[PDB]
Amino acid sequence: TQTLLRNFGNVYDNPVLLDRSVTAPVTEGFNVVLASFQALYLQYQKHHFVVEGSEFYSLHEFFNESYNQVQDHIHEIGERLDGLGGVPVATFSKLAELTCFEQESEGVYSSRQMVENDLAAEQAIIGVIRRQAAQAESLGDRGTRYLYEKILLKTEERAYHLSHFLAKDSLTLGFVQAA
Amino acid sequence: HHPMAETQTLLRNFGNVYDNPVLLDRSVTAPVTEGFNVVLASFQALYLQYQKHHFVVEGSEFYSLHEFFNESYNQVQDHIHEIGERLDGLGGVPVATFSKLAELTCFEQESEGVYSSRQMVENDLAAEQAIIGVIRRQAAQAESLGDRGTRYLYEKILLKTEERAYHLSHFLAKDSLTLGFVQAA
Amino acid sequence: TQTLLRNFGNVYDNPVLLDRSVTAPVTEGFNVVLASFQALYLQYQKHHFVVEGSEFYSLHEFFNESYNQVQDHIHEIGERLDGLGGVPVATFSKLAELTCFEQESEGVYSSRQMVENDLAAEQAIIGVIRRQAAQAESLGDRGTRYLYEKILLKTEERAYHLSHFLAKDSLTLGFVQAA
Amino acid sequence: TQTLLRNFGNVYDNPVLLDRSVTAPVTEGFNVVLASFQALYLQYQKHHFVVEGSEFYSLHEFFNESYNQVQDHIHEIGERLDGLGGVPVATFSKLAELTCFEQESEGVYSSRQMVENDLAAEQAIIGVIRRQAAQAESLGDRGTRYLYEKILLKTEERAYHLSHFLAKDSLTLGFVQAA
Amino acid sequence: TQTLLRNFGNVYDNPVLLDRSVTAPVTEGFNVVLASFQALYLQYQKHHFVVEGSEFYSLHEFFNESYNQVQDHIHEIGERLDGLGGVPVATFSKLAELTCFEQESEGVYSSRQMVENDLAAEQAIIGVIRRQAAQAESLGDRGTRYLYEKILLKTEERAYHLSHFLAKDSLTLGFVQAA
Amino acid sequence: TQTLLRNFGNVYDNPVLLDRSVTAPVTEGFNVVLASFQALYLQYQKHHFVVEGSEFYSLHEFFNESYNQVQDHIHEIGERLDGLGGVPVATFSKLAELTCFEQESEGVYSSRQMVENDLAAEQAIIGVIRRQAAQAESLGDRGTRYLYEKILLKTEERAYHLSHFLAKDSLTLGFVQAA
Amino acid sequence: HHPMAETQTLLRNFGNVYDNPVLLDRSVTAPVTEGFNVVLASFQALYLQYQKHHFVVEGSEFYSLHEFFNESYNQVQDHIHEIGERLDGLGGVPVATFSKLAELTCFEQESEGVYSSRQMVENDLAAEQAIIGVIRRQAAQAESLGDRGTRYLYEKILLKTEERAYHLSHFLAKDSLTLGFVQAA
Amino acid sequence: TQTLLRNFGNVYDNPVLLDRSVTAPVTEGFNVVLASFQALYLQYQKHHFVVEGSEFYSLHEFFNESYNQVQDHIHEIGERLDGLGGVPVATFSKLAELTCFEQESEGVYSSRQMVENDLAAEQAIIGVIRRQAAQAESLGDRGTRYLYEKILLKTEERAYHLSHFLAKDSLTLGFVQAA
Amino acid sequence: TQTLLRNFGNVYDNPVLLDRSVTAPVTEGFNVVLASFQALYLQYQKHHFVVEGSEFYSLHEFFNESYNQVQDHIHEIGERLDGLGGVPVATFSKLAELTCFEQESEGVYSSRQMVENDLAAEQAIIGVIRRQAAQAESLGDRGTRYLYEKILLKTEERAYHLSHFLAKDSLTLGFVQAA
Amino acid sequence: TQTLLRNFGNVYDNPVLLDRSVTAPVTEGFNVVLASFQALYLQYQKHHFVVEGSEFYSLHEFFNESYNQVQDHIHEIGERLDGLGGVPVATFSKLAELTCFEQESEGVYSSRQMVENDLAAEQAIIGVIRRQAAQAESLGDRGTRYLYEKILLKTEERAYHLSHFLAKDSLTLGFVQAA
Amino acid sequence: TQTLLRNFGNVYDNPVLLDRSVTAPVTEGFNVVLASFQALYLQYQKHHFVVEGSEFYSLHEFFNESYNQVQDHIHEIGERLDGLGGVPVATFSKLAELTCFEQESEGVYSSRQMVENDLAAEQAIIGVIRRQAAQAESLGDRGTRYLYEKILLKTEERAYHLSHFLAKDSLTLGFVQAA
């Protein structure tokens, strides 16, 4: 709140011998992924707060595990983005601009809708991560490629879990009428 | 389909208060949950700002500041968790979208870009102070309305928030071990 | 160093002063129980991997706890079996021959069917453990009798839990059509 | 044990935006590696139970550590194989069909022969993991490639340790007759 | 060192509703097992201090684990013996009188002889524990019978381990001359 | 508080292959022991709250350790009682009916009276446990017999400790007038 | 130099209140911090006394008393830490010298020498009671002045202090297992 | 607060076979060191409360570590002083009389002045400890000599750290004007 | 492998460059201290088992802490004694010969007598440790001197505690008849 | 047993099926990276010992964290290097020959110079690790490539931190003269 | 790498009231011991990496424990040397100059030769530590003397353990031909 030292959207020097021709696209991509994960952190946390119904106890725990993991991804991305000379996004307006998926609207939806929304979000992020990992590989930034692969594996795992929640099976099918 | 047709069907609508299981009247839970959403949004703003500061702080005292900013946004996250759970418990609908968070926060986030460590600490202190003001107002309201649990929760959070403000103030004080061998302004 | 030192199916010396007339049938029985628990470990672990649907999170956890406990039983049995001069079973073909229940067929079944299959397996094993405990008692091998009783109690406990999963009650009965 | 939902040998849908042209070969390969590791888990565990003689205390511990680590590999593989829409192997007969090495025969061998057998098993598995990692890389499954590399490093480490046990050196050479 | 309250060799009252016809023989037996375990604790500890040579690191650890476990047996026995109204043995002379095996003579023996001596000691103790467990069972002292069975299983396990150390196998047989 | 599914006093099915001719008397006995332990939990907890005087600090801690242990017994009994098809007691009136000892009257008694009351309670429970263990043994329910023996040993140990508190010895006898 | 020349230069002067970062007026922070210094001094006195008792207690119940006195002075140390940090945060200057501590404590420390275990426990109880009185007064003051964080902090400390008083009272009660076989007075 | 049993300044009996010609000077010295450490505990704690400015976070932590360590020294000294028959100092007035350095005056000084004051205090205490250690050695109280040496090493280490804080170096010298 | 390799009472080689003229008397003394601590371990443990009456809970705990600490001393002494080329004592007869105090006679004494007996034992051991520390110092074995001083301080501390138990003070003096 | 078994500079057998044409250059490179990290471990540790001045507390901690992390890298590299049939460097002279950066000269430099020197060292090592990772990839040694990428990411992270320490910002700029 | 503040080989001021007539020889000696321990750390670590053969598992662990302990000695020495105003050695060339033993040559030796080399190194270090402790004592630096005695005891312990590994005893002597 006064005199800027470094401007958002510019890439500055780094101490790890990468050219700014590498760090500019790499940090731009990191900001997209950071914004997307902030959007997803907020959404999972909302889901944690509001989920109700017969399986809410397990969903409540899963949503908490999930936003904690997303928070870890955020921490690793922000630290590396800054390390490489980038300026990390932090304002609501810019986060909204950069996120690769649109957050769930305000209000409370069903547990199935929440899980669907989280899965579509993870899928959007998977797409971006794969693109950014390929770019890092091509540009010779192994550290970034490896970091993205670690995060990708965890992200794919969350998607697996979400898919499991949505599957059309239940112990109740033994004594309730199927659709 | 028609633009006004409902895809994704809402159960609770934002801005409205629903039933609660703890025998509090809506005359209590409506203002209490409205206030919780302001505090929630403000703490989300501050979490993001402290975390930004954690990422970007540099210079001669950055190691201590880096750790302090991490501790601080972790604590703010704990406040957020307690508020959101109770807000929902009382029948309210917690805010979660970037646009509404920006509308409800009681202070304006630091602009994009990187500022000095002193400016960052000043910005965090001004944010904590804004939040202190709202928490005191909301705690008094909860007291007057008979919501003891909310009043107590706010007092727990207030004490931690005041503590962060004390630390921020200490970082800003015009003293340093370096004064023994550098030229004072 | 290339030749067999002990042959499967024979009992050798033991250092705990038990007659080979005791250790032969005791270790033969341990091998049946070992094989049965390997079969069940594999089945629980499969169930852990594939279970899906509305209660999958709790079932996923339960199946993991269960195969970890079964693995502990296997460890205790194998160590004691060798200690008593027996040769423990370890090949796929012989495990299939000795197991007291037939593994679930390859493919994926419903969560209710998986739970039913695990319960039937635990019940087969309970039967064998009771017979082997009685034998150890009769033959004067207190240590084996006691070990089996410890394992029996845990095995009975898993059966209780499985039966709870199968019971025809749910929170959903308040708002879904029964039958 | 009644109505199959999904058939072994088929690949189904996944939630991580991979084409079945990728997930079919990847999950087929995972099932070979899963079966191989189950064979090795059983063999290491056998070795833990039966190893004896002057260095048995160290070997006993090493074999325990090793089958625990192999069990972790199995858990990771099974979870991912299922996530990608595959059906994991779990029956004795199919495991025997798919394993890339032949288990040690029933009976007890010498400590040196057990260690040689475990080393040959790790080496077979190393070969398959390398082929499957190269495949994952070529097909664009970074998550799978990365997971295999993590597992490869640990597997290579076990091979190093087995090789060290076999080396023709001992403190006893100071006072016993060398061959 | 002045005025005795209770005399060694007498059984006094107990608070667990057992007749002195039961507690007299039970506590007499506990004192034999207590003395035997004190003898074995001292012997294992000696072995821990003095064991040397090519496998001493493993033997050193094993002997430490073993005397720690024996100390736990002693604690349980002494507490129960006192609870049942008995007076526990504690003097060197009486311990020597009651132990069911003769301690290793002063001096240092070879590692193989130390292990043989510990095995013979465990075997003597196994015999007494079995007789005392049978007695407790016949007299209706279930608590005592159960405690002995717990201790028996651990004692048998130590005997298995000692037997494994003595087995005529070694990795060194690949490159040293066998007798 | 509306429509009963299962009635108190009836035994239902179990999944561990025991006949209802076994589980009826076994679960009836478990309810007596459960009620008795609830009575004792409440009494120990009261004693924890109200004990005062020169040794209150140690007594306060002992009473807390004791009711925590009794709570563990309760947990194990209730779970098994339900597992075997029984319906566990939980109302104040029925607990009062089934307890094998009468709770201390309301009010605060001396520390010695409290300890005496707890000892008489443990002694009542010991009697019932031994009877129920014998029954389980006779009826072939090994798991129940073993569970009771574990609990019996802990219960006897509490009785030993209580007896120790009551003994007519004190460090104060060196400088206070004896009765 | 002249005796009135300043060697070691003071930044804050004892007895005065400076700025705080938590939006409380000096009309609040002056009496609040004055009271905190009394409570701080009183707890330092009690820490020293409990620790003395820990060192010197002997006799038939000394093992339990020894442990209790240790637990107690550790807890008092925690109270001291919370008070001192908040006192400074609010702009006050915490007392630390032996002379001023002796002036401000709300009870008189036990005299040098060794007393009986009963007398030691009586002295500790009387000290806790003095401190309970001051804490209740200071909590009421904080409430009336609108310093919720201070009021809450004092209530946390009060509950622990009351708990120590309950335990002390229990040690003093005229009951013992020995009454079954020794002559009552 | 009534009838003294033992008087301050007198030395009483001890149970460790030291003559009162030893314990009188040893305990007198322990009281000087105890008083000095209480003075320093209070001063470090004050510094913890009041330190502010650009390095306050590290200083705040250091001052807390330091007064915790001083508290440990106090505990060891008081226990041993009493053990040897001495009466430990505890009143503000007597502490002020016996401390070997004068506490910082009331008020808040600069961080550099605080660190200087703490260093001068540690230096005073080092002097006394060395004198008292030499005395203990001369008088044959090895335990006291050893205790003082343990405390001396920690005290010297605090002095090293304080000296490091005061040194005329800073990362800021790269971009601020030197004096 | 059956014959003695080292004889009791003789010193053998050491690897720490100490003359056998040092290690002979040092290890002879270690054996006296070892035997004395074995005697005290047994005595404290007896006291732990049998102590009863109004303060038994605290005494029970103290005796356990004490014999655990004595066991640590024994471990350090035995290891160092062997390290220096000595042969550690381990038989009942030789332990009785070397202990520097006579064990409490069989039977049960009062709590005050037990505490008095433990104090007399600690005092005997303090005497020997001081003599052996002085010897090690004179002979140039710093390591032994230091080890003894560590043990001495803990031993003195136990003596302090024992003397506190014996002091003629009690909370009960407020309401029982003195003398 | 006195003669060299393997010569430095030669590669020997490996058990992971890699051609010696791979393991020779891979292990040669590991030795350069090992030597470079030993040089850096020593330098960071020196910096830890000697750093002083206004920010020394944070720098002291950072240097410790850093050399602990470097030590972990050394451990992983040395183990793998030996595993692949290489001989690891360990002598001062050869370490000096192989390190990819020159250690700071003896004596003490300013905190800013120490940090600059550590940054230059990390940057030299980053260069070598990237070259060696690329080589491992090209030669088909995935495990080595992956290990290097893990180490690279941690090494890049230390470089980020060092550069943060060096940045021309401070809280002191608010009240000291710039330039 | 620019402007020295302090020169190697000079002693500067200290804050613990020791004359430079004391700190000069003390810090010179600390640098010899520091260099010797760095040499030994590197040698033990090498041995950890390369040890192989029938007892390698135990030796591998022992060497790891040993270099970890040596690293702790180094940390303590460097911190104290700096505290006393000395400049610690850190370059390969100077370390080689100051070490009191010559490192093992590059290459791999047998396990027995490695253990012999480590023992000779410990023995060289024991000699220097004893001389430096005597010096510290004579010069009045109690802190330094005490620190050396702590380190001496651990160093002697490592020498005991190495000696035990070298002893001409093995379990294998029961079935292999002795030289």
Side-chain angles (χ1 to χ4, degrees), chain F residues 49-59 61 110-112 115 165 167-173 175-179, chain G residues 59-61 63-65 67-68 71 118 166-184:
Chain F
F49 294 151
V50 307
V51 64
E52 61 182 20
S54 309
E55 310 88 26
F56 101 95
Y57 186 93
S58 287
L59 286 164
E61 186 176 319
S110 71
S111 59
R112 176 168 292 272
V115 174
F165 279 119
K168 296 175 171 271
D169 185 39
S170 169
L171 293 169
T172 65
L173 287 176
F175 53 96
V176 307
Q177 185 62 42
Chain G
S60 308
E61 310 86 22
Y63 187 90
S64 287
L65 287 165
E67 183 181 300
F68 172 79
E71 290 165 333
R118 178 167 287 271
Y166 302 143
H167 295 151
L168 291 164
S169 184
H170 279 41
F171 279 117
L172 294 169
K174 293 188 166 64
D175 187 31
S176 169
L177 293 168
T178 67
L179 291 176
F181 56 96
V182 307
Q183 181 64 49

Side-chain angles (χ1 to χ4, degrees), chain I residues 94-112:
Chain I
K94 192 74 182 188
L95 289 164
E97 180 182 326
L98 294 179
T99 179
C100 70
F101 78 94
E102 179 73 6
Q103 293 183 292
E104 174 180 295
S105 301
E106 305 291 16
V108 181
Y109 293 94
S110 71
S111 57
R112 177 168 288 273

